[PDB]
Every structure is written in structure tokens, then in C-alpha cells.
Amino acid sequence: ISGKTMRGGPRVPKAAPYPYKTKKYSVFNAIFDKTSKRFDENSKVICVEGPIAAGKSKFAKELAEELDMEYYPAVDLDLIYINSYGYDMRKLDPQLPPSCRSYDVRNFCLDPSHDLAAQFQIRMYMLRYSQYIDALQHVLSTGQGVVLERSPYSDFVFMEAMFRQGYLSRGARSVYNELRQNTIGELLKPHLVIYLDLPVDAVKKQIKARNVDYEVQSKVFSDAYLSDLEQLYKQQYLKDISTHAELLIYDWTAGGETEVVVEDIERIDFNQFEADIHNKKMLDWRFPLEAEWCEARIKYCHEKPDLMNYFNVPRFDVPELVRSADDGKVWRDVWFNAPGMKYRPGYNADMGDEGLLTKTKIGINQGI
Amino acid sequence: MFNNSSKILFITIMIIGTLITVTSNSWLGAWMGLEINLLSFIPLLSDNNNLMSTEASLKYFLTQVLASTVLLFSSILLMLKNNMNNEINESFTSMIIMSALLLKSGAAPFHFWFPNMMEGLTWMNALMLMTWQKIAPLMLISYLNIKYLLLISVILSVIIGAIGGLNQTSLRKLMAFSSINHLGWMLSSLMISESIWLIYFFFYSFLSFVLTFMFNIFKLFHLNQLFSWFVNSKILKFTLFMNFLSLGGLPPFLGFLPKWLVIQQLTLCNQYFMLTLMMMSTLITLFFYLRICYSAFMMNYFENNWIMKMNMNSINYNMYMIMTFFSIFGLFLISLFYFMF
């Protein structure tokens, strides 16, 4: 993956980028537009990794700037608590039942032993899923690679970290394992992963480098929990990914510099895995025909409601993930009658949208 | 169909083979059309990332190849004895032709491949299997004037397809057993009026083609996936689940009309006992339709908490709600129709 300096300037595309957010790509659109006419050496998925506090955002933004890639930060719960109109839904909690109240990252940090925190972990996985297809829509349709601050593959370690600390039961672990077995097999594993290795204590020191109140007055950021994440990462997750992705582990006790991390990438030969068609490295990203490339692009553009509807699994034995029916009706009549989500986010007259009388357009892969 | 233009080619050769079958004035042209239809429908229904879809394709292949070879055998015997394409008086080789056609159609007691294979499918290939693949054997049954064998097939199909669908909680095998029960109503209409059969088949394929779209879009392969299915308004789920009462034959929905025209044409042709036997059959079909209808008629459910937004296709959900309106308020078009005169 050539950087900005070896290329001699900004990256030029091999063909015209497809407007994937505006034009729907389907089977009948696959004849005129072909997927592999845009792919190059820069069209790879790079996922940066690491512990709780490792400077992933600034390093990933600098890696996106130097390699001419699209930056995708880690998804937080302000994507669904704050809708497209800017109204935060964390102010609806007096009217909501206590089993249906808002629960975000700071609510996990203040109250770790809450039931809905397990739901929160499951919710976070869905949000990571909700960006990963948005990663794979960007690589396949435009031909420019992406960088991800965290991965949907990188989220079961958080589940096991809550489970070994006692914040989750066996039932929520079994539920999240069933959703992971149901959903992760439809994704393509990333091309390259960068893990920023840190000790258990130094991350805590980096907590004091952040000075936010809800992460310093909390209880979860202890010696056993961060050691549990470090053990889970380096003993299960990275060893499972290194059979597919070229793993790069750096020590980040110091500040570090993104240029040497860029310069280690071009020393990797990515064409040595194409000699064997049954090689485990880059197995999900090789396609022998142009029609298989268009088949994957159709699966990742026209079948994103398919992959989001694969989460509809029934699990009723747990009492932490089952919403009460009276509480569900009260939640519906508060949440869907709130300003900003009475209708579909295009057609909402209460938030100043004009020209609704002649408008019949809807968003492609849009949450209703 | 999905993800490839070669599947559109396979659909084109599917339509070509079925229309070659049903237009044939000889049994050999009908047989080679069935060969073309089988050739077209083996590659759809085959997927190497699914371990059970290949087994379903193998079950379909073995059942259709056995049924096509018996069909050619008795066709050759019919040409050997009564040298024209048909038979003047009914004999046993016409019964062998009808039995080999009933193995293709999936009627009882040759029904056993049909819901045992439908567990391995998706929903769109299920809809192609139980609507379009029943064009070619059922239209070839119309050339045979046999009453006892067809009557035994009708009685066995409406008894088994009602009783057998009670045990399965999977929606694909339940809908396959529903298609066996609706096959008996088609075969009961096949020996009184071919037009009334065409109307029952068109409305049954319409109700199948609207009930597939609710299961294909939201990927509802189980009964409790309906109970966990998230909608943004519970009145919308209440309205979307009225198509099962339509397919159960309950007036004033659209699906009362084809059952009603079959009952009217059967009573005009002086059949009353097997009609009464098909009254008791469709109560059991409406009974296992109501276990789906438990998922929307109680208006409030202990639902899973993590999912918050429902997702759908644009054109598929746009075409779904045109036909859901006509599967509920379709009896207002009773004055527009002119086939039934």
C-alpha cells in the first residue's frame, strides 16, 4: 500500500467513483458498472486496534491522511440517541420506564452492574456492524480503502471482559455468542490490522492523560479488567485474525510517530498471497472473476437490510434482554412520538423540512 | 434473480421450458419441456455456502428425474397401444401418466419430498418451487379424464397437508404443507373447470407471492422470529398479518374469492361429499395459520430489547404493500372481474 510520498502526490482514482449513497447498486446495475475496475494497491481495509486509552483516533486520522484513505472512527451511542435532527433522546428518560431508560458509555462507567449494560454491549456490536458494511460499501464501490478505529470482530473481547468481571451472566454471554455466530460470517475479514501494544498500568496513566470525569471516578478501569482485555486480545483475537490479516504490533508507551508506521506498510508484499488460491491470508478478499466482485458488491450494497435483519433472533430465557410489554408500549408512545422521530427522517414537518407535498424519495440503506 | 445475471438467464430458460411444456400437443414435447425446466431449476436452489441447499437440490433432482422417466415410459406405452397422443377410453397407462405427474406436482401420497426438501431453501426459491413449478404438471393433468385417482389424490392432499402442518414450527415446512393443502383444492377444480383452476392458481400464487415478500425481506425462517420481529408501530404488524386470514379463506378478504369460486363450481357440478371433506381440511389450515397470527393479534409482546430499527429494501417493500392492500380489500374488485361468466 503506497503512501503519499512514494506516489509523488495525492492519490488518483483508477476510474470514476460510484455514488453509492445516492444511486442504488443492484443486479441490473451490475452489467454497466463493474467492481474491479476501481481496485488498486490502496483499496484495502486497515483496522487500527488497541486498549481503552492508546491514542487510536489521532493515529488513525494521521494514517488516513498519509495513505489517502477514508477515516472511520469508533461508533458511539450518540448515533442513535442523537438522531438526524440533532435531538438527543437522553432527555426522554423521565417519561420512559426504568427498564427502557437511556444507557450509554458513561452510564456503564457510573453503574457497571446494571442489566441493560449487557444490552449496551450487544448494541455496540450492532453499531460496529452498522459501520463495517459502511466500510465495505466504500472499498468496493469507490475503490478507496478505509481505516477503522475498531472492528466488529474486536467486540467479543469486551463481552468476555464484562463476563469475567461479573457484569454479565451466562445467558447474556450465550445470547451475544449466538448473535456473533449468526452475523459475523457474512463479513469480509480486514486486510491489515495495527495493534498498539500497551501495559496494564500505562493505559491507566493514559486515563490520567484524558482527565474526563466519568472515567476517573468509575470502578471498571482497574488492574484486573485491563489485564483481561490484554489477555483476551493477545491470546484469542489477534491470533484468530493473523491467519487472514497482516498483523502489525507496535509498542506505544511513548508518543510515537505515524510516519514509520506508514513506512512499515510498503515493506509488506501483498502479492505473495495470490500465488495460492487456497491461501488463508486474503482469502475473503480474492475473487477469480469480475462477476464475483459484482456479486460481493451487490451483497454489500443491496443487501444491507439483509445483514441488519439477520440480527432478528429470538432469545427469551434471559431477563436482562426482554422488554416488558406494558413498558414496550409506553416506550413506543414516548420514543416514536418524540420530536425528530415521528416519521421517517426525510419526511418530518416538525423539524422544518419543506416541500413534502411533491417529495417521493427515500434513502438507500436508511434506518426507518 | 439475486446477485447474478446468469440467474436472470436461468429464470428466462425456466419460463421458456414451462411454456414449452404446457403448449405441447404431444407428450414428448411436454416431456422435453420438463427436462428444460429441470435444467433451469437445478442451478437456482444450489449454493456452496449452504450445506443444506445442495441436499435440497439433490432431493429435487432425484424426485424429478424419477418422475420424468416414469412419465416418458407410460407416454411411450400410450403411443404403443392407442397410437394417437391421447386415449379414447381410460386405462392403466393413463393412471401411470397421472401418477408420474402427481410426483412432479407434490400431491399426496407422493408429497413426501416436498416439505422435507423445503427446509433447505431460501424464500424466493420456495416461491418459485410451489408456484411456477406447479404450472407444468398440473396443466398436464387436465388432459386425463380420471376421477378415482384424482379424487384419492385430492382427499389425501387435503387430509395430509392440513394435519402435517401442525407439528412444524419452521415457516418453510409449514408453508410447504400449506401448499400441499392448497394443491388439493387445485386438483379438485381440475376435473370440473380448467378456468376455475387457473383462477384458484392465480390467486393462490398471488397470496404466496405476497407472503413470501414479508418473509424474504425480514428473513423470518422460524415462528419465534415473527414474535421478535420489530415494527415501529404495532398497528402495522396487525395489518400485515391479515394475509394469513386471507389465505385461510376468511371473508371479506381476497382469498375467500378463489375458494368460493371453487365451491360454487363444485356444487354446480354435483360434488358435495369431497367438498365437505375439504371444509374440515381448511379449518386445520386456518388453525396453523393462526399460530403465526398470535404474533400480531395480542397487540403487545415481551420483545427483545437490543434491536431498535427495522430495515427493508426499497422496491421490494414498495411492491409488497401494493399487494397487501389487495389481499385485504380485494373483494371490492368483484364487479371488475369478467372471467367467471
Binding site: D326 | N224, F227, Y294
Partner: peptide, 13 residues
């Protein structure tokens, strides 16, 4: 309105 389908009703399917 007082009774709604519990998970014990959900268990039989």
C-alpha cells in the same frame, strides 16, 4: 390489557 404474551408463551414454539 392486564395479561400479555410472556416468555412462557414464547417457549412452546
Amino acid at each position: 390489557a392486564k395479561w400479555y404474551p410472556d416468555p412462557e408463551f414464547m417457549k412452546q414454539f
